[PDB]
Amino acid sequence: IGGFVADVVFFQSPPSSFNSMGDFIRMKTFLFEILEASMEKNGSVSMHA
Amino acid sequence: QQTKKIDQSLSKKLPKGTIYDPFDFSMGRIHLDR
């Protein structure tokens, strides 16, 4: 998401697009809603989507 | 559909929280880190 890797949760069901596309899922673009963004001592940014 | 399973030899697994750039997805990144 915008240059940052975020921890993504699912709305109780993975879309069938995942099963269809398999390991090639990176090809397609999805929509994400950022719950929160936080920091860590190592300077990393941990964001939940 | 077509072939659907691939190994880990040539698919970069980005760590969580790490900042990335578009180039990271290229085949060049795999050569560079190997």
Partner: peptide, 25 residues
Amino acid sequence: EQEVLDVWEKKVVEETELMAARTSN
């Protein structure tokens, strides 16, 4: 990212063909 991922896609299909061929041997 798309203009990179298309090239990555073609490269991966060609290489997986090559490695399947080698493994079959």
